[PDB]
Design a protein around this ligand. Structure first.
Ligand SMILES: O=P(O)(O)C1(P(=O)(O)O)C[C@@H]2CCCN[C@@H]2C1
Ligand SMILES: O=P(O)(O)C1(P(=O)(O)O)C[C@@H]2CCCN[C@@H]2C1
Ligand SMILES: [Mg+2]
Ligand SMILES: [Mg+2]
Ligand SMILES: [Mg+2]
Ligand SMILES: [Mg+2]
Ligand SMILES: [Mg+2]
Ligand SMILES: [Mg+2]
Lengths: 334, 334
């Protein structure tokens, strides 16, 4: 709440910096159009964390107006990365809405031009890092952090699509081992490691063990956030979530289907086999009815309880020498 | 011819390095599938230039087997970047074939999953640079070079799509000023600056003026290569080019249409207006007939002659202190 207006208000400086070649304005005009649609209307938790962690980890006397300017910019970089993956994930998952509005590629006049928009979002990350942090000692560390988070998330997307070929029956693919691999990579997308590591490096905290300890708390959290997202795909209210679910239709290796398969009788397996991964509303309804018969909502609620206590246990073990408050603020959103 | 087998043979080491987490092999297996389709069957001019320039610019006594290993790897990085842009450009331009085979996204079982494949290609650039060149003094310079070439090409793609909205008549957009902006950015894709700069940095040649001189020769060359590509879109034999042209159908600000507009009478402008940017075979035929009536092929031949002499003139002015042979080998392909 306290850092937001100044985070959001920086957006105008972000757009100015790239724009200032009469040519290049047009492209930044479309970037501007794309961000105003695709990185405006979110809760900005990931971006804001860079600033919130900055202020926790750098002594107030070192928090001059230029270092804040760099911190706001890096938080927005985290928001650009997220938007990059989302613009493209929605095309690939054939999604309808995000954030309560029609997905960007579904907008008339956009379509598969949204492929380039996504790539432009990603390209603008590294330009802004260059323009704001190039003379800084942590510059390479931050480039490598963004590149590595992007790699991890990308491998995740690749395993997601590979396990979910359209038009095919294979629940055999949907194993607990397979899901644990996919989620490990997808968690990189949700983990607050990227913005908390960024602020750490900006604070001059670059030790490998301290990074590995934080990464470990934050990765387990990222995994919970992906399982919650899988749950909310079907059982979430779209007016709260802002998006229509597609996992059943898309033949996805969801947490829900993996839990179903572990608890299904042979006949229940046949209902799943005949109904999963198809577009017909009445077939999706059948899968949802089965999940409810198996008490999967109750199973999720219990998993959420168990997972919260574990993350808190990891914070108690792994936070030091960082302030536990770095981790606990984010955990408050579990 | 002389560096190729060892460039191509390194591909196997490239795939090994990324693969060596049982998980990650699957994703590199698909990268492998994607490259074997999408970065195998080309002339490899861009990738091979890194090596050819390496050997010209580093004294033989400094050309140990590990530095060559790094050079082969960086050349392949240039090939990954090119493939990234091509995989995505073909989806966006609704293309049918490339390199004489069906475009990757047109393959049954691929489709819009090709969006992720492209992103994976790009992600693999920076991983390989990290794995091979991380301890090297030129490491940051090379990351920034790839990031900057990618930015320039991306802005180009953005201006290309913006000037060519589907379903619309506007030849008014198709001005000589507009084309000169688009091509400046698109030239980054063709310019051999990226692989020649890479070898320069690897040779410890990092002076800004020497880079700016080379960039200037190489950019004018890149512009010619884009104009040739525009020409070949319609007047090329697909069996030589490997690809079916889509520029007329796609409503593109091509060199051909810009030259047409500069030479058309008012009635010829009406034929263009009624026929450009549409899918009907008979309408495209009408535009091609008009271009021929305006002697656009002769105009291209003369432009090619004029442009070759100019590039040679820039080499004479700007090559020193690099060996002119750096530039002349590439020019041999004009
Ligand atoms: O579509 P979302 O937002 O639910 C999804 P995913 O398609 O389920 O996997 C897209 C996001 C980016 C990649 C990792 N997962 C999150 C969640
Ligand atoms: O489709 P190509 O290969 O002709 C093309 P473009 O769509 O005409 O513009 C794609 C390439 C990458 C970007 C720059 N142009 C080259 C040429
Ligand atoms: Mg999705
Ligand atoms: Mg997805
Ligand atoms: Mg989801
Ligand atoms: Mg094309
Ligand atoms: Mg194109
Ligand atoms: Mg072309």
């Amino acid at each position: 709440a306290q850092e937001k207006q100044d985070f959001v208000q920086h957006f105008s400086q972000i757009v100015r910096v790239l724009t200032e070649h009469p040519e290049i304005g047009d492209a930044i005009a479309r970037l501007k159009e794309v961000l105003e649609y695709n990185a405006i209307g979110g809760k900005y938790n990931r971006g804001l964390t860079v600033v919130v962690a900055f202020r926790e980890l750098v002594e107030p006397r070192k928090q001059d107006a230029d270092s804040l300017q760099r911190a706001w910019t890096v938080g927005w970089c985290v928001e650009l990365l997220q938007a990059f993956f989302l613009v493209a994930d929605d095309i690939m998952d054939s999604s309808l809405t995000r954030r309560g509005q029609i997905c960007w590629y579904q907008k008339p006049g956009v379509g598969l031009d949204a492929i380039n928009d996504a790539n432009l979002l990603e390209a603008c990350i590294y330009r802004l890092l260059k323009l704001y942090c190039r003379e800084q000692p942590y510059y390479l560390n931050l480039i490598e952090l963004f590149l590595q988070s992007s790699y991890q998330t990308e491998i995740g997307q690749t395993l997601d699509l590979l396990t979910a070929p359209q038009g095919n029956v294979d629940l055999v693919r949907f194993t607990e081992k397979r899901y644990k691999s996919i989620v490990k990579y997808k968690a990189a997308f949700y983990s607050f490691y990227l913005p908390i590591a960024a602020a750490m490096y900006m604070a001059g905290i670059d030790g490998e063990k301290e990074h590995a300890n934080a990464k470990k708390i934050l990765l387990e959290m990222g995994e919970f956030f992906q399982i919650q997202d899988d749950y909310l795909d079907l059982f979430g209210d779209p007016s709260v979530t802002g998006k229509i679910g597609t996992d059943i239709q898309d033949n996805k290796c969801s947490w829900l289907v993996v839990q179903c398969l572990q608890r299904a009788t042979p006949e229940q397996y046949q209902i799943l086999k005949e109904n999963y991964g198809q577009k017909e509303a009445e077939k999706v309804a059948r899968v949802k009815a089965l999940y409810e018969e198996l008490d999967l909502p109750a199973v999720f609620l219990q998993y959420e309880e168990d997972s919260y206590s574990h993350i808190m246990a990891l914070i108690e073990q792994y936070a030091a020498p960082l302030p536990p408050a770095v981790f606990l603020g984010l955990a408050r959103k579990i």
